């Protein structure tokens, strides 16, 4: 028992388009058909009307000659054929049949205008921030400058639709514009992502908005300061912290000395608890136009192993305030290095040297230490890259080995010793020969 | 040749009983139809003639009327309720319907929810910064918003669309963008986007200081 | 017509201390006069009592042969002589008089304690920010730990007495405790300030907290800079110069920016030639408390190629002089890598994943790009190490692609590719395959 | 030898005619003083004898009594009035008073005003953390206290100390710190203090985040 209208949607003032009604549902050549439209926010309006067979036909002021009521009850459809379009005809237009008017139809909306289709844009938006409190983050949704209607938004396509406001779009000199708003709990949020699905039929524009949020976190107070001094810190070298009868030593020097500046005085923290260095202080150094305040303390090994701090508290005349920095460690749960060995490749072996690789790799951190051994000990050449973070988190290493055929050929055997925490006792190796 | 439809719209609540007419121009005997238009659909035909409710129609839903006037009195509101209704002169070609009256539901008052929000980082970047500020369910429709570009200021560039009586919910939830220049909105810090409704005899603000986020 | 008591406060348990109620307003000598006390809560206990002259001396119970009451009444004076003191003795001690006890003293507060005079501690108590509705700002102030008592707390240095409520003092395990508040109206506080004033007696400990409200979080960084912005150039990325359909841009962006320094007015230089960038200007962004204005402008290949310099004139309000830094090339006779390729080492080869090793070698120089592709096209996971010079003066790259053991045993085909100048027709590439 | 004072405490309001007696063990031949003793200072001689008013004494104020039993009647009561009162055992050393009773004075109910002030920041950093709590201006003096470390606790750690009946105001304004571990605040966050008076049949609370700056 229902009748559905056709196309009819955006047209250029004065031009035309064709409507057409269509039905079902029973007998269509024995009724009457009109059509009615209305405009925004307005009351309705009669127009054309037809008849059953197609003799009486009438029309009204607004589209007398201008718009033509056609029929064709054979395969059931009535028409409307909107010739000369003033701007004042831009509505949606129903179909119903008399009898008294029983049974409109959807609709369709023509709208009058000399505007250019124009894709909008669609702008996040994520809250400042704050608190998220009352476990109802609020989102929304912004749609800007598109033309001409309508949009369809949609939230993580269509699946959330609990508390959801989209708002009725609104012209703004010859652009649209509107938003959508969504009520859901605190916690899925930040976890499970929120998209705003959007498309402007009329155009073709489908989009998928991820609402990221920022980070209200303030950490913007990095400066640099010009006057006096800034020191750095700087951790042991691996090898000292894992050969045992070597002092891993952690230094920390000063560089824009003048001369004013005296003698500083270093004083370091493990874990706030101050200790006395060892006169760390071959002090300054006259370089490029001040000088440079060394401090190298000592310190046991398993003291950096365990994961102690290393505050280098200094006071001086033209100090503003009495500055240190920690170095504590990498972090986190040691990997130990799979490390491998790959001998020269088979396209480079006619040439005058070759390159035996020595391919450490998912380990952590960093912290580690790499020497090759030709013959049976320390050799040179060997160069190492440095720790570049792989994939899943891990690291990895190559260090390249450097000799010639007599030498390879005469299997001279190599090795690759690696220094590693995560270690059996701290170390490995591996080995390659012809 | 002319019917007009009484109360442009009608605020009323359950069980209330609701009535509204239509006067027309000349002599029509009784040859209006009255006909039911909720939102975002198709409208239907509710009475028609003088009374004779429509097959698909409540006892409820009553009309009278014979000339100059028409009624249309409804013993009791309801969810099934909630839509534009008016007249349509059926006499003699052209046919003109009323005006349309809208009928509101009433529920009992019910403050706003807002939440402003900071123009995106994608925004801002092409020039333009959009302060939106979404005050979410809330009855009724009478309520004042009110930016403060900084220390107190409204200012123009203010977009405020409303929504339709939710059926269910049935509370509007106004949104209120703000648009101006990037930079305009870099000269200044804390954007303060209030707003008075009725219910809190205080207004109800919200807002932040342009920072990191 | 009046008398009132002298020192008296706290004295370890059992030792000893001497009170004297000191009288005028009449004549002493004529009267009689006792000394009762009151402990914490507690009634009104008679104790010792003489009389005129000094004949009856009637004492009590608590405190007979180990408190003595004397007089003098020539100099107008009673006294008491506690000697053995009993814990148990602690309270007030009045002085009255005769004829039914009708003038009482002040009173002096001994407190019979083992503990030791320990000074408090002044801890403000702002309020937890929230708005300051109703007008009324109530604030306080807290002391802890203080031995013994009394002590002294005023307002604003006893100014402020409108609403305040000092709060008795509490023992708990040998210190006292207790804390004040201040009704005041919301505006003045903010601005004119409140500070919390107290003293302990017993130490001599004046003290004066300002009781600031809850210090917040994002506060300014607004690090301070002094003479003008410095402009760093940097070269195009290699990949950029090499591949024909992209355009190297070559930029060039100012750093110390307030909220003076215009749009700057970038300009360039292609061999002291000046040319149009291309509007290469976005500008401002509020950084960590300065902006930057950058200059991406792009160029043809072949210029950089050939070897042109690339000056960046700009000119600003603040510019002392209108600076600029060219970026032409990094000169030498250009060595063309060797590119290699390494499939998954034996040792590796039941792991879940492997990786492919991209050897490029004795290059120069470091402006060169790497990519793979498994299948026949772009992939992900190969990393890049950074240029390292070796032995003789040249660089070498390694570079790792990760995949599975399913995906290589398929005889999948993956491909390096290698884009460096000294390469026929600026590019080359190999191919591993199971 | 020993006299005890009736009704350890009364609560009355102005104009109430408010009345105390005194037993003593044995006969005592109106030998009574009923000395006053206003907070924070002096007793003050009242009566002395069986009655006899001291001079710089009120009508009002009144004496009786001769053996085991002595009373004092006091037709209206006042802000002069409010005071603890104790007989004093004049016939034979050793002295004795009374117990004392504590005339509290009436005015009908006034509820509390809270106000939970969150650990100062020089204190966190000594390790320990001080949770205030001031309940100030409410009548009476009954009333029950009660913290929340974080969802619904009390603990212990609590000092709560009154404050004596004001002279004009007429109400208690106790407070109610709370003392514990600095981080063991720091693994809560949102900290109670909640408050059950007679006023408001509903509790009084008031609180926090911890996440507050
Ligand atoms: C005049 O004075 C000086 C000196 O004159 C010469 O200066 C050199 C640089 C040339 O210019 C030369 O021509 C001049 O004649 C001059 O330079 C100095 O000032 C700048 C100011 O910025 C200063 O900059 C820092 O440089 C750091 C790098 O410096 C190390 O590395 C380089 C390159 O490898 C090396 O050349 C340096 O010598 C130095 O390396 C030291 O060297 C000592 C010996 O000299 C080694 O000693 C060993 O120590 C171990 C134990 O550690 C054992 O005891 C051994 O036995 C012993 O031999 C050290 O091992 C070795 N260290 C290392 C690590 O190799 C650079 O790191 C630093 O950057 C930090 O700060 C910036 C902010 O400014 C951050 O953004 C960075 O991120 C970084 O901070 C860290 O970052 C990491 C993440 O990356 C974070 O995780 C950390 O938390 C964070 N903080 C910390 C504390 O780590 C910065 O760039 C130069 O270093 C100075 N020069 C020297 C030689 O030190 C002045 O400019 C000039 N004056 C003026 C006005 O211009
Ligand atoms: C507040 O403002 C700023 C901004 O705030 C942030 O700053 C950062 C750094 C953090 O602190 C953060 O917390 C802040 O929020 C702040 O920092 C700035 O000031 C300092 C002042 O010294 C300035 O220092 C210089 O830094 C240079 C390194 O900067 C580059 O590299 C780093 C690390 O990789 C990177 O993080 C930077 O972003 C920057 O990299 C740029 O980034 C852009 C995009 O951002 C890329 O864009 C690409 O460009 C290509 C074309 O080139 C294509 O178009 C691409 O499509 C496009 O995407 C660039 O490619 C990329 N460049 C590179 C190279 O990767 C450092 O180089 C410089 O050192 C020179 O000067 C010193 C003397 O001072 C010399 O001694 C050095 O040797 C060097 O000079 C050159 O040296 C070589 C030899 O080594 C010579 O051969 C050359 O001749 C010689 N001259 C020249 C001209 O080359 C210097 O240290 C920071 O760079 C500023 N920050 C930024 C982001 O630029 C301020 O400190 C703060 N204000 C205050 C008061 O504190």
């Known amino acids: 028992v229902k009748l559905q209208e056709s196309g009819a949607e955006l047209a250029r003032p004065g031009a035309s388009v064709k409507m057409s009604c269509?039905?079902?549902?029973?007998?269509?050549?024995?009724?009457?058909?009109?059509?009615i439209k209305q405009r925004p926010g307005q009351g309705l309006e009669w127009?054309?009307?037809?008849?059953?067979?197609?003799?009486?036909?009438?029309?009204?002021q607004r589209f007398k000659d201008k718009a033509t009521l056609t029929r064709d009850r054979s395969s059931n459809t009535a028409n409307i054929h909107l010739s000369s379009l003033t701007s004042d005809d831009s509505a949606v237009?129903?179909?119903?049949?008399?009898?008294?008017?029983?049974?409109?139809?959807?609709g369709t909306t023509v709208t009058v205008s000399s505007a250019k289709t124009t894709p909008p844009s669609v702008y996040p938006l994520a809250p400042g921030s704050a608190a998220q409190t009352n476990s109802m983050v609020t989102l929304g949704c912004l749609v800007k400058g598109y033309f001409p209607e309508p949009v369809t938004v949609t939230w993580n396509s269509g699946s959330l639709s609990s508390g959801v406001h989209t708002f009725p779009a609104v012209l703004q000199s010859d652009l649209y514009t509107l938003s959508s708003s969504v009520t859901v709990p605190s916690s899925p949020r930040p976890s499970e992502t929120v998209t705003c699905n959007v498309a402007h039929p009329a155009s073709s524009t489908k989009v998928d908005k991820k609402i990221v949020p920022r980070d209200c976190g303030c950490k913007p107070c990095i400066c640099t300061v010009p006057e006096v001094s800034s020191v750095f810190i700087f951790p042991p070298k691996p090898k000292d912290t894992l050969l045992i009868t070597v002092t891993p030593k952690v230094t920390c020097v000063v560089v824009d000395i003048s001369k004013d500046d005296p003698e500083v005085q270093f004083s370091w923290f493990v874990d706030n608890v101050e200790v006395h260095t060892a006169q760390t202080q071959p002090r300054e150094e006259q370089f490029n136009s001040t000088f440079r305040v060394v401090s190298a303390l000592p310190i046991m090994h398993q003291d950096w192993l365990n994961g102690k701090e290393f505050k280098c508290r200094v006071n001086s005349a033209a100090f503003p305030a009495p500055i240190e920095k920690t170095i504590s460690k990498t972090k986190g749960k040691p990997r130990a290095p799979q490390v491998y060995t790959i001998p020269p490749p088979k396209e480079q072996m006619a040439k005058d040297k070759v390159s035996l690789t020595c391919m450490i790799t998912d380990f952590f951190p960093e912290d580690i230490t790499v020497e090759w051994q030709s013959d049976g000990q320390a050799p040179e050449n060997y160069k190492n890259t440095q720790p570049i973070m792989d994939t899943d988190g891990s690291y990895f290493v190559y260090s390249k080995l450097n000799v010639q055929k007599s030498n390879w050929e005469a299997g001279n055997t190599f090795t690759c010793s690696v220094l590693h925490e995560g270690l059996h006792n701290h170390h490995t190796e591996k080995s390659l020969s012809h | 040749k002319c019917a007009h439809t009484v109360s442009k719209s009608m605020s009323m609540s359950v069980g209330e009983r609701v009535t509204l007419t239509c006067?027309?121009?000349?002599?029509?005997?009784?040859?209006?139809?009255?006909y039911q238009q909720k939102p975002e659909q198709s409208p239907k035909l509710?009475?028609?003639?003088?009374?004779?409710?429509?097959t698909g129609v409540p006892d409820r839903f009553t009309g009278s009327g014979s000339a100059t006037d028409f009624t249309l009195t409804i013993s009791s509101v309801q969810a099934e309720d909630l839509a534009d209704?008016?007249?349509?002169?059926?006499?003699?070609?052209?046919?003109?319907?009323?005006?349309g009256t809208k009928l509101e539901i009433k529920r009992a008052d019910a403050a706003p929810t807002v939440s402003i929000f900071p123009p995106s980082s994608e925004q801002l970047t092409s020039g333009g910064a959009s302060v939106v500020c979404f005050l979410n369910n809330f009855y009724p429709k009478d309520i004042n918003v009110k930016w403060k570009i900084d220390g107190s200021e409204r200012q123009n560039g203010v977009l405020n669309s409303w929504t339709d009586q939710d059926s269910k919910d049935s509370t509007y939830s106004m949104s209120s963008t703000l648009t101006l220049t990037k930079d305009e909105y870099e000269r200044h810090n804390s954007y303060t986007c209030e707003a008075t409704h009725k219910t809190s005899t205080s207004p109800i603000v919200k807002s932040f200081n342009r920072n990191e986020c | 017509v009046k008398l009132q008591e002298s020192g008296a406060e706290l004295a370890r348990p059992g030792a000893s201390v001497k009170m004297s109620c000191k009288a005028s307003?009449?004549?002493?000598?004529?009267?009689?006069i006792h000394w009762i006390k009151q402990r914490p809560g507690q009634g009104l206990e008679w104790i010792g009592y003489?009389?005129?002259?000094?004949?009856?001396?009637n004492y009590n119970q608590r405190f007979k042969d180990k408190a003595t009451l004397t007089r003098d009444r020539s100099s107008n004076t009673a006294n008491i002589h506690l000697s053995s003191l009993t814990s148990d003795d602690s309270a007030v001690y009045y002085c009255?008089?005769?004829?039914?006890?009708?003038?009482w003293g002040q009173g002096t507060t001994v407190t019979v304690s083992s503990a030791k005079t320990t000074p408090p501690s002044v801890y403000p108590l702002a309020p937890g920010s929230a708005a300051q509705t109703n007008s009324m700002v109530t604030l306080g102030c807290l002391v802890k730990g203080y031995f013994p008592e009394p002590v002294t707390v005023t307002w604003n240095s006893g100014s402020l007495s409108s609403g305040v409520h000092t709060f008795p003092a509490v023992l708990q395990s040998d210190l006292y405790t207790l804390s004040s508040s201040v009704t005041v109206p919301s505006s003045p506080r903010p601005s004119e300030t409140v500070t919390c004033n107290v003293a302990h007696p017993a130490s001599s400990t004046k003290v004066d907290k300002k009781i600031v409200p809850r210090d917040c979080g994002c506060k300014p960084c607004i690090c301070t800079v002094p003479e003008v912005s410095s402009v760093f150039i940097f070269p195009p990325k290699p990949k950029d110069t090499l591949l024909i359909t992209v355009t190297p841009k070559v930029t060039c962006v100012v750093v110390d920016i307030s909220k003076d320094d215009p749009e700057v007015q970038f300009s360039w230089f292609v061999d002291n030639v000046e040319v149009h960038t291309a509007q290469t200007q976005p500008r401002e962004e509020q950084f960590n408390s300065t902006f930057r204005v950058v200059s991406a402008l792009p160029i043809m290949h072949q210029d950089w190629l050939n070897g042109k310099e690339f000056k960046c004139r700009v000119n600003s309000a603040a510019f002392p002089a209108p600076i600029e830094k060219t970026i032409s090339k990094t000169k030498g006779k250009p060595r063309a890598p060797q590119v290699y390729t390494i499939p998954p080492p034996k040792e590796q080869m039941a792991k879940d994943k492997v990786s492919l090793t991209c050897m490029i070698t004795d290059f120069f120089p470091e402006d060169i790009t790497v990519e793979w592709q498994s299948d026949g096209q772009a992939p992900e996971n190969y990393k890049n190490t950074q240029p390292i010079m070796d032995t003789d003066g040249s660089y070498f790259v390694y570079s790792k692609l990760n995949v599975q053991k399913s995906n290589w045993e398929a005889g999948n085909t993956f491909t390096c590719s290698v884009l460096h100048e000294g390469l026929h027709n600026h590019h080359t590439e190999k191919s591993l395959s199971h | 030898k020993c006299a005890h004072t009736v009704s350890k405490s009364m609560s009355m309001s102005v104009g109430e005619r408010v009345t105390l007696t005194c037993k003593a063990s044995?006969?005592?031949?109106?030998?009574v003083s009923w000395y006053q003793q206003k907070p924070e200072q002096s007793p003050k001689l009242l009566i002395y004898?069986?009655?006899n008013r001291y001079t710089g004494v009120p009508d009002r104020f009144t004496g009786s009594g001769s053996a085991t039993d002595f009373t004092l009647t006091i037709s209206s009561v006042q802000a002069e009035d409010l005071a603890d009162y104790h007989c004093?055992?004049?016939?034979?050393?050793?002295?004795?008073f009374g117990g004392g009773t504590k005339l509290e004075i009436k005015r009908a109910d006034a509820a509390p005003t809270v106000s939970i002030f969150p650990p100062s920041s020089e204190q966190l950093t000594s390790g320990g953390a001080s949770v205030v709590c001031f309940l100030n201006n409410f009548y009476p003096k009954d009333i029950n206290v009660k913290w929340k470390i974080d969802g619904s606790e009390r603990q212990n750690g609590v000092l709560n100390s009154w404050t004596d009946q004001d002279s004009k105001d007429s109400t208690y304004s106790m407070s109610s710190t709370l003392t514990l571990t600095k981080d063991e605040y720091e693994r809560h966050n949102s900290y109670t203090c909640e408050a059950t008076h007679k006023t408001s049949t509903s509790p009084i609370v008031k609180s926090f985040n911890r996440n507050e700056c």
């Open positions: 004898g069986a009655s």
């Open positions: 004093g055992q004049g016939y034979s050393y050793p002295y004795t």
């Open positions: 044995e006969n005592v031949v109106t030998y």
């Open positions: 307003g009449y004549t002493f000598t004529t009267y009689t």
């Open positions: 003489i009389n005129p002259s000094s004949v009856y001396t």
């Open positions: 009255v008089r005769e004829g039914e006890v009708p003038y």
